[PDB]
Design a protein around this ligand. Structure first.
Ligand SMILES: CCCCCCCCCCCCCCCCC[C@@H](O)O[C@H](CO[C@H](O)CCCCCCCCCCCCCCC)COP(=O)(O)OCC[N+](C)(C)C
Lengths: 57, 70
């Protein structure tokens, strides 16, 4: 019943954060303090849309 | 004398029979209608009768669930 639509491989290409979990944990508090607005935008969109394909940007 | 002191006229029994017949005929048609109504309600289930319980929807929790995709 229907065809499941998926984004192309080019749509999923992004400049990745290539640092380990120790670095992330060391930075986590200041990262949450500084980079909060895009993170909350993403998470609100993620719990509202309930769809990974609607939250890629 | 016997007719006067022990019995009544034909009108009483005649009209009593009329009333009795009317009641009994109504009861018969009511029984038939009731059977047909039961058959229809049990077949379709759109009536007040034969209503079987389903899960109450007030039990559902509508909250964020630690995961965006439920
Ligand atoms: C020659 C002339 C006499 C002829 C023979 C007549 C003898 C008749 C005896 C047989 C009677 C048969 C039954 C008749 C009564 C039926 C029941 C009831 O309908 O009768 C009631 C009357 O019944 C009497 O009150 C009681 C009769 C009891 C007879 C008993 C006789 C034997 C007794 C012996 C005792 C002896 C003494 C003790 C010695 C030890 C009144 O009826 P009712 O509900 O209004 O009817 C509605 C229509 N109305 C309003 C127009 C009347």
């Amino acid at each position: 019943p229907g065809i499941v639509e998926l984004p192309t491989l080019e749509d999923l290409k992004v400049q990745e954060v290539k640092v380990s979990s120790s670095v992330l944990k060391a930075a986590a508090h200041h990262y949450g303090a500084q980079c909060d607005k895009p993170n909350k935008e993403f998470m609100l969109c993620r719990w509202e849309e309930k769809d990974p394909r609607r939250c890629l940007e | 004398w016997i007719a006067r002191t022990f019995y009544d006229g034909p009108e009483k029994n005649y009209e009593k029979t009329m009333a009795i017949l009317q009641i009994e005929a109504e009861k018969a048609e009511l029984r038939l209608k009731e059977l047909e109504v039961r058959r229809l309600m049990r077949a379709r289930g759109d009536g007040p009768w034969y209503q079987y319980p389903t899960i109450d929807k007030a039990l559902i929790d509508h909250s964020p669930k630690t995961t965006p995709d439920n």
